[PDB]
Amino acid sequence: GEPDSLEVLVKTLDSQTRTFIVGAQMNVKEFKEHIAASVSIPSEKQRLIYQGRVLQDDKKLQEYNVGGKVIHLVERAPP
């Protein structure tokens, strides 16, 4: 039946893409924590980018309509 999960592709600057399947209401901060082990970047050092814009920690992934899409991941010092 109806999806309660999203497919989210994360592509790092080495051009590796990894796919994650996560809860449809998960937020950006939770997502960074989720992918941290696989991408080898602590959540506080992750910058996620989609359609030219940096994803905000307090927003829900669904607010960016990222289901089935490639998000870019960049490693940067925490602000």
Q: How was this structure determined?
A: X-ray
**Residue 45: how many CB atoms within 10 A of its CB?**
13
What does the buried/exposed string (b/e) look like for 54-69 if buried means 16 or more CB atoms within 10 Å of the residue's CB?
ebeeeeebeebebeee
> Domain of 15: which CATH number?
3.10.20.90
Distance from chain centroid for Cα 11: 9
- The encoded tokens of residue 68 equal 């089935």
Domain around 75: 1-79
**DSSP letter, residue 60:** B
The angstrom resolution of this structure is 1.8
Query: Considering its fold, how many domains does the chain have in total?
Result: 1
SS3 31: helix
Distance CA 65, CA 6 (A): 10
Instruction: Determine the Cα–Cα distance for residues 14 and 73; give it in Å rounded to an integer.
Output: 10
Q: What does residue 56 show for φ and ψ, rounded to 5 degrees?
A: -95, 130
